[PDB]
Amino acid sequence: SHRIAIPLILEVGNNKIYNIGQIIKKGNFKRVSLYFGEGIYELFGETIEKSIKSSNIEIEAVETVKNIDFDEIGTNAFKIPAEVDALIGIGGGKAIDAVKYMAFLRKLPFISVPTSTSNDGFSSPVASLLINGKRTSVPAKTPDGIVVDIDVIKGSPEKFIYSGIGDLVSNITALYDWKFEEENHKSIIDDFAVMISKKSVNSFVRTDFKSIKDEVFLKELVDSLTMNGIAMEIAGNSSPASGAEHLISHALDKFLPNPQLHGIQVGVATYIMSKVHKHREERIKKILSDTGFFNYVKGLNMKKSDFKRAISEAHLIKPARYTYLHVEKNCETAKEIVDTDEILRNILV
């Protein structure tokens, strides 16, 4: 008994920041507040303000987002003046998630304007926040508008792109777990959500590329991450884009003091789960190699022992689900993979 809110505004391409005003006019907002990640205003602020003001939209306030702490977010949410019609979030994944959550708490339209794509948070119904010092995924609301400027994304640090590659590829293992879950009568698949998620991913995986900062490559990456969010909205849950691989990453977040980027953790987890599933192994290996994902991850010195533990505790994150990692045998296989596999032996310490 669930309701679907497909975003009204979807713009991925060139020259978007400059035209943000005309882009969001479709929402009929009279009065907005802009929330910028640190340093972001210095880069794009004036242009964004000019653009919005010239589209005859008033700006109540311009603020900076400094953290993803649940308490500070709730405080700030209720500080938002009652005459505000809409929230605009401009920045990285953390900034987006914070503003998204405020809009959720105040039941306000939210426009997502990410300056990087480290994951699909910028398009989805879930927010990643700090809850009692621990990074945690919590229900929020899907953005009403998503505006991604590929020029801006071109300029982002490569860590965020690798992170995005990791969160995208996870759709392959997530869908497999979802099907396994259904076969075990522990859920029901949403066919359309599967179809779009699958199409987004397969489009990306097939795209030729010279480098990861390639415009065509980035446009495909962003389109798919956007799609993933909408697929979640359509399904009414995270399954289209979140399976065991995600549960592994969430488990890591609960005991590591300094977890790596969500996308990075999810990517490694996806590789692992592919070998456990014995499904789409070559595709996943190829994309994560060819893009330099594995290369990059080696430099981070993630521990085998931390993954082994996350694998064991993955099921605790969503105990009513039934992924491969809700089965003890599959956990042991997963752990044996982490100890044996050649790529892992290389990129993990």
For binding to a second copy (CB under 8 A), which residues are involved?
1, 3-11, 26-27, 30-31, 70-71, 74, 78, 81-83, 85, 105-107, 109, 131-132, 136, 138-139, 144, 188, 191-192, 194-196, 199-200, 202-203, 206, 223, 226-227, 230, 234, 316-320
Minimum CB distance to a second copy smaller for 127 or for 297: 127
- Binding site annotation covers 142? no
| 53-79: b (≥16 Cβ within 10 Å) or e | eeeebeeeebeebeebbbeebeebbee
181: contact with Zn ion by CB under 5 A: no
31 binds, among Zn ion, a second copy, none (CB under 5 to 8 A by kind): a second copy
List 167, 223, 233, 245, residue binding Zn ion (CB under 5 A): 167
89 is in an annotated binding site: no
Contact at 8 Å (CB) between 32 and 59?
yes
Minimal distance in Å, beta carbon 141 to a second copy? 9
167 binds, among a second copy, Zn ion, none (CB under 5 to 8 A by kind): Zn ion
Q: Which is nearer to a second copy, 230 or 252 (CB)?
A: 230
Phi, psi of 134 (to 5 degrees): -110, 130
Please check if 118 is assigned to a binding site: yes
Question: What is the four-CA torsion angle of 37, 38, 44, 48, rounded to 10 degrees?
Answer: 40
> Which does residue 144 touch among Zn ion, a second copy, none (CB within 5 to 8 A, set by kind)?
a second copy
Q: Which of 284, 298, 293, 263 is closest to 163 using CA atoms? A: 263
85 interacts with, out of Zn ion, a second copy, none, CB within 5 to 8 A per kind:
a second copy
Give yes or no for a contact between 266 and 317, defined as CB atoms under 8 angstroms apart.
no
Alpha helices (H) along the chain? 20-24, 40-53, 70-77, 93-106, 150-154, 158-183, 191-206, 215-235, 244-255, 262-277, 281-290, 293-298, 304-317, 328-340, 342-347
Q: Smallest distance, Å, CB 197 to a second copy?
A: 12
Query: Would you say the C-alpha torsion 111, 175, 224, 11 has a positive or negative sign?
Result: negative
Q: Which partner in Zn ion, a second copy, none is near 291 (CB below 5 to 8 A by kind)? A: none
Cα angle 304-69-169, degrees, rounded to a multiple of 5: 45
CB closer to a second copy, 5 vs 61: 5
Site residues for Zn ion, 101-130, by CB under 5 A, read 119
**CA gap 93, 241 in Å, rounded:** 17
Q: Does the annotation list 262 as a binding residue?
A: yes
Residues 6+ apart with CB under 8 A from 274: 172, 173, 280, 281, 284, 285
Please, which residue, 71 or 332, has the CB nearer to a second copy?
A: 71
- Minimum CB separation from Zn ion for residue 120, in Å? 6
In the complex with Zn ion, the residue whose CB is nearer, 124 or 330, is 124
Please say which residue, 73 or 347, places its beta carbon nearer to a second copy: 73
Residues at the site binding Zn ion, with contacts judged by CB under 5 A: 119, 167
